[PDB]
């Protein structure tokens, strides 16, 4: 048991923690990206829904053109 030996042990522990911290950061970034992608998909669906509503309105206007 020596102070120098302890320091070496302490150094290894610090390195392991850094790797874990990096992994967490990477995971967080992935989660953020995933959330962004999901939001984009939701927005895209909304746009389609809006487009569909407009199409129905346009169709209705045409029908009353001559009573088809």
Coordinates of N, CA and C in Angstrom, one line a residue, residues 10-67:
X10 N -6.6 5.7 -8.7 CA -7.4 6.8 -8.8 C -7.5 7.3 -10.2
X11 N -6.4 7.3 -10.9 CA -6.3 7.7 -12.3 C -7.2 6.9 -13.2
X12 N -7.2 5.6 -13.0 CA -8.0 4.6 -13.8 C -9.5 4.9 -13.6
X13 N -9.8 5.2 -12.3 CA -11.2 5.4 -12.0 C -11.7 6.7 -12.8
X14 N -10.9 7.7 -12.8 CA -11.3 9.0 -13.4 C -11.5 8.8 -14.9
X15 N -10.6 7.9 -15.6 CA -10.8 7.6 -17.0 C -12.1 6.9 -17.3
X16 N -12.4 6.0 -16.4 CA -13.7 5.2 -16.6 C -14.9 6.1 -16.6
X17 N -14.9 7.0 -15.6 CA -16.0 8.0 -15.5 C -16.1 8.8 -16.7
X18 N -15.0 9.3 -17.3 CA -15.1 10.1 -18.5 C -15.7 9.4 -19.7
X19 N -15.4 8.1 -19.8 CA -16.0 7.3 -20.9 C -17.5 7.2 -20.7
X20 N -17.9 7.0 -19.5 CA -19.3 6.8 -19.2 C -20.0 8.2 -19.5
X21 N -19.4 9.3 -19.1 CA -19.9 10.6 -19.3 C -20.1 10.8 -20.8
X22 N -19.1 10.4 -21.6 CA -19.2 10.6 -23.1 C -20.4 9.8 -23.6
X23 N -20.5 8.5 -23.1 CA -21.5 7.7 -23.6 C -22.9 8.3 -23.3
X24 N -23.1 8.8 -22.1 CA -24.3 9.5 -21.8 C -24.6 10.6 -22.7
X25 N -23.6 11.4 -23.0 CA -23.8 12.6 -23.9 C -24.2 12.1 -25.3
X26 N -23.6 11.0 -25.7 CA -23.9 10.5 -27.1 C -25.4 10.0 -27.1
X27 N -25.8 9.4 -26.0 CA -27.1 8.9 -25.9 C -28.1 10.0 -25.9
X28 N -27.8 11.1 -25.1 CA -28.6 12.3 -25.0 C -28.8 12.9 -26.4
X29 N -27.7 13.0 -27.2 CA -27.8 13.6 -28.5 C -28.7 12.7 -29.4
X30 N -28.5 11.4 -29.3 CA -29.4 10.5 -30.1 C -30.8 10.7 -29.7
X31 N -31.1 10.8 -28.5 CA -32.5 11.0 -28.0 C -33.1 12.3 -28.5
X32 N -32.2 13.4 -28.5 CA -32.7 14.7 -29.0 C -33.0 14.6 -30.5
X33 N -32.1 13.9 -31.2 CA -32.3 13.7 -32.7 C -33.6 13.0 -32.9
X34 N -33.8 11.9 -32.1 CA -35.0 11.1 -32.3 C -36.3 11.9 -32.1
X35 N -36.3 12.8 -31.0 CA -37.4 13.6 -30.7 C -37.7 14.6 -31.8
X36 N -36.6 15.1 -32.4 CA -36.7 16.1 -33.5 C -37.3 15.4 -34.7
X37 N -36.9 14.2 -35.0 CA -37.4 13.4 -36.1 C -38.9 13.1 -35.9
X38 N -39.3 12.8 -34.7 CA -40.7 12.5 -34.4 C -41.5 13.7 -34.6
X39 N -41.0 14.9 -34.2 CA -41.8 16.1 -34.4 C -42.0 16.4 -35.8
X40 N -40.9 16.2 -36.6 CA -41.0 16.5 -38.1 C -42.0 15.6 -38.7
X41 N -42.1 14.3 -38.3 CA -43.1 13.4 -38.8 C -44.5 13.9 -38.5
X42 N -44.7 14.3 -37.2 CA -46.0 14.8 -36.8 C -46.4 16.0 -37.6
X43 N -45.4 16.9 -37.9 CA -45.7 18.1 -38.7 C -46.1 17.7 -40.1
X44 N -45.4 16.7 -40.6 CA -45.7 16.3 -42.0 C -47.1 15.7 -42.1
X45 N -47.5 15.0 -41.1 CA -48.9 14.4 -41.0 C -49.9 15.5 -41.0
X46 N -49.6 16.5 -40.2 CA -50.6 17.7 -40.0 C -50.7 18.3 -41.4
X47 N -49.6 18.5 -42.1 CA -49.7 19.2 -43.4 C -50.6 18.4 -44.4
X48 N -50.4 17.0 -44.3 CA -51.2 16.2 -45.2 C -52.7 16.3 -44.8
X49 N -53.0 16.3 -43.5 CA -54.4 16.5 -43.1 C -55.0 17.8 -43.5
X50 N -54.2 18.8 -43.5 CA -54.7 20.1 -43.9 C -54.9 20.1 -45.4
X51 N -54.0 19.5 -46.2 CA -54.1 19.3 -47.6 C -55.4 18.6 -48.0
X52 N -55.7 17.5 -47.2 CA -56.8 16.7 -47.5 C -58.1 17.5 -47.3
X53 N -58.2 18.3 -46.2 CA -59.3 19.1 -45.9 C -59.6 20.1 -47.1
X54 N -58.5 20.7 -47.6 CA -58.7 21.6 -48.7 C -59.2 20.9 -50.0
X55 N -58.7 19.7 -50.2 CA -59.2 18.9 -51.4 C -60.7 18.6 -51.3
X56 N -61.1 18.3 -50.1 CA -62.6 18.0 -49.9 C -63.4 19.3 -50.2
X57 N -62.9 20.4 -49.7 CA -63.6 21.7 -49.9 C -63.6 22.0 -51.4
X58 N -62.5 21.8 -52.1 CA -62.5 22.0 -53.5 C -63.5 21.2 -54.3
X59 N -63.5 19.9 -53.9 CA -64.4 18.9 -54.5 C -65.9 19.4 -54.3
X60 N -66.2 19.8 -53.1 CA -67.6 20.3 -52.8 C -68.0 21.5 -53.7
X61 N -67.1 22.4 -53.9 CA -67.3 23.6 -54.7 C -67.6 23.2 -56.1
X62 N -66.9 22.2 -56.7 CA -67.0 21.7 -58.0 C -68.4 21.1 -58.2
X63 N -68.8 20.3 -57.3 CA -70.1 19.6 -57.3 C -71.3 20.6 -57.5
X64 N -71.2 21.6 -56.7 CA -72.3 22.6 -56.9 C -72.1 23.5 -58.1
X65 N -71.2 23.1 -59.0 CA -71.0 23.9 -60.2 C -72.2 23.7 -61.1
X66 N -72.7 22.5 -61.3 CA -73.8 22.3 -62.1 C -74.8 21.2 -61.5
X67 N -74.5 20.8 -60.2 CA -75.3 19.8 -59.5 C -74.9 18.4 -59.9

